[PDB]
Each structure stands twice: as C-alpha cells, then as structure tokens.
C-alpha cells in the first residue's frame, strides 16, 4: 500500500525565514489530492490543497500537475510564532460525493527560535 513519509521530526527556523516541509508518497494508487494541515483533529487548519484554493505563501517544491510525481514537499514563506505547530502531509482518496482522508505522515514539528 501507499505510505506517506515526512523524513523530518523537528524543523527549527528563524522568524522571517522560509521553511521546507518535506513529504514523500511511495505509490500513486489510489488517486486523489494531497493536502497539508497544521494540527491533527477536527480542529486542524488547512495549509495547502493540490486540487483547489489559493494559499498565497505556500509553494510546492516539485510540480504537482504532472502524473508520475511523488514529491509533496512545501515551502512556507515568512514563518513567525503564529505558524508554530505540527504539520501533517495527508493523502485523500476518490472524490464522489467528497474527498476522503486515506493516509497521513507522522508529522513535522515546526518552531521558531527567539
């Protein structure tokens, strides 16, 4: 089956720097969009969604358009204390009637030095 790996446990960045949050899929089946959230529960916050939405200070590292692609890493600009937390990379499934969570990475703890 598809496994979602985020190799970093902790990422420590300086206030104002951009942080790279790294994530890899091992398969391409099942098809569906990757999404990034900060936090794990139903209180989680959408950080990025491949399918839909404009997330003005996130860039993808690779190009997610081209099928064959398996790098779901992201860059988030101008990190501040407000951005602190734990970022999960999350595979969704299918589509109809809605996208359904399938698999999630272990999580990358982002923080800021003072």
């Amino acid at each position, epitope marked *: 089956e598809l496994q979602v790996i985020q190799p970093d446990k902790s990422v420590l960045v300086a206030a104002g720097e951009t942080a790279t949050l790294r994530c890899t899929a091992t398969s391409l089946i099942p098809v569906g969009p990757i999404q990034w959230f900060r936090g794990a529960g139903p209180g*989680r916050e959408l950080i990025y*969604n491949q399918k839909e939405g404009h997330f003005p200070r996130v860039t993808t590292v690779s190009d997610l358009t081209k099928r064959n692609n398996m790098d779901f890493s992201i860059r988030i600009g101008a990190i501040t204390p407000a951005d602190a937390g734990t970022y999960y990379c999350v595979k969704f499934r299918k589509g109809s009637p809605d996208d359904v969570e399938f698999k999630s990475g272990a999580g990358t703890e982002l923080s800021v030095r003072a």
Partner: antibody, heavy 119, light 109 residues
Framework: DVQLVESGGGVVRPGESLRLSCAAS????????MNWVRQAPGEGLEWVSR????????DYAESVKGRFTISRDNSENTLYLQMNSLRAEDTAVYYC????????????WGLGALVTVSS | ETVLTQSPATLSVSPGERATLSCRAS??????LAWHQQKPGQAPRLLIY???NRATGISDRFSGSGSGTDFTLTISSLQTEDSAVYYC??????????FGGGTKVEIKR
C-alpha cells in the same frame, strides 16, 4: 470577483434567536477560515467568532460564549452564525470576513447585516 | 496578547496635504501588519498588507512603511472621500483577529 453577502438580519426581541447567513462566491469557500466581526453603533470593530476550513474548529469571543454558534456548509459555499439568548448589547452590524491564510489578516469583508434587538 | 497602539486618535489634514497615521506594537510584529479603511456606514476594506503591499485595486495614494514595532500609513493627496476610520491588524502572533483602537481622519479647516 470575491463576493461576501450577508442576510437574515432585522429586528429581534431579547431572548429570541436569529441565524445570520453569509453567501460566498468568486473563490474556493472550503479552503479558507471564515470569521464574523461585529460593530455596535459608533464603536470599534469586535471579533465575534472564527471557523475552520473543515468546519470542526471554532473560536468565540467571551462576550458571546455559550450563546453563539458558528458553522458552515462547504457544499453550498455558506457561513452561518446562530445567535441564541440575544440581548440588547448584541445590537450591531455583523460582518462575515475571509482570511488570506489560516493565521492571517482579513482578505475581504461582507456588506454587513444590521441586527437590532429591542422589545 | 500583543498590544497595538494606533495613534493619534483623530487626525486633521487640510485638503491636498499628506496624512500620516501611526500604529505601534508592544513587541515586534515583523512585517505582518495590515491596514483597513472604514468609511462611515460602510464595511471595511483592506488597503495594505505585509506592512508595505497594496491590495488589488487600491490607489497609489495609500502607502505603508516600517518593520518590527513602528508602522505608518501615508495618504498622499487627501480627498474628502478619505474621511474614514483606519484600523491596524497584526498576524505575527496567534491570534490575528484583534484590531488597534483606530484613527479617525477628518478634513482640517
């Protein structure tokens, strides 16, 4: 372009309930956190509540806690504010507002719906 | 919570002159400062975000400057249509949804 259009306001009696709705278009409603922000006659703007993208995560100013419920419908692109046990100091123009990012400034404001509470 | 001191409370500017509004944070807010305009009896509109960037559609008469704790909004060639209240909003710390006290701008005579 992005449009935020509130409705459901008017005159209500103290102790009545009232549902504001904000109809959203010109963007991907499900990808943003949404807020309600109110303004009493001649006061500063007062943040009332916020909601997640997914709908399961909700914060509320302490002046409305226990009495106000925020919720949303991603299918229909609509924000709600349920307001129970209303009283006279809840009289204001209530605006819906979009965030740029989940932890950022307000991108867009609604037209705003007036809510008068009076016996 | 970061304290945002907007100042002065009211500012009078004669028609055509520059108007200079200040907002000051209790502790550093980096670049993450946004300015809104609310004309009487309308909703607010975003003018400036990221301390210095104009929003889409906004006039070049409105400009933002500063970093850290001290910020400015500058209105170049003041028209009667700029009579309004202006609020600052920081989003460097969680939570973003607090405002300064606002600064009312009125035409000096």
């Amino acid at each position: 372009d992005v449009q935020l259009v509130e409705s459901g306001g008017g005159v209500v009696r103290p102790g009545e309930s009232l549902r504001l709705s904000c109809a959203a278009s010109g963007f991907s409603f499900s990808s943003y956190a949404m807020n309600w922000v109110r303004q009493a006659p001649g006061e500063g703007l007062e943040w009332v509540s916020r909601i997640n993208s997914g709908g399961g995560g909700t914060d509320y100013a302490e002046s409305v806690k226990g009495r106000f419920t925020i919720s949303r419908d991603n299918s229909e692109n609509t924000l709600y504010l349920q307001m129970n046990s209303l009283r006279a100091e809840d009289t204001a123009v209530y605006y819906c507002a979009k965030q740029y990012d989940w932890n950022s400034f307000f991108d867009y404001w609604g037209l705003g719906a007036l809510v008068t509470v009076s016996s | 919570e970061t304290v945002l001191t907007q100042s002065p409370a009211t500012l009078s500017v004669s028609p055509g002159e520059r108007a200079t509004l200040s907002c000051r944070a209790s502790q550093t807010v980096g670049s993450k400062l946004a300015w809104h305009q609310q004309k009487p009896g309308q909703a607010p509109r975003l003018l400036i975000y990221d301390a210095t960037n104009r929003a889409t559609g906004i006039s070049d008469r409105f400009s933002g400057s500063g970093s850290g704790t001290d910020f400015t909004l500058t209105i170049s060639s003041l028209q009667t249509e700029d009579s309004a209240v202006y609020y600052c909003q920081q989003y460097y710390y969680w939570p973003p949804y607090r405002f300064g006290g606002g600064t009312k701008v009125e035409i000096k005579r």
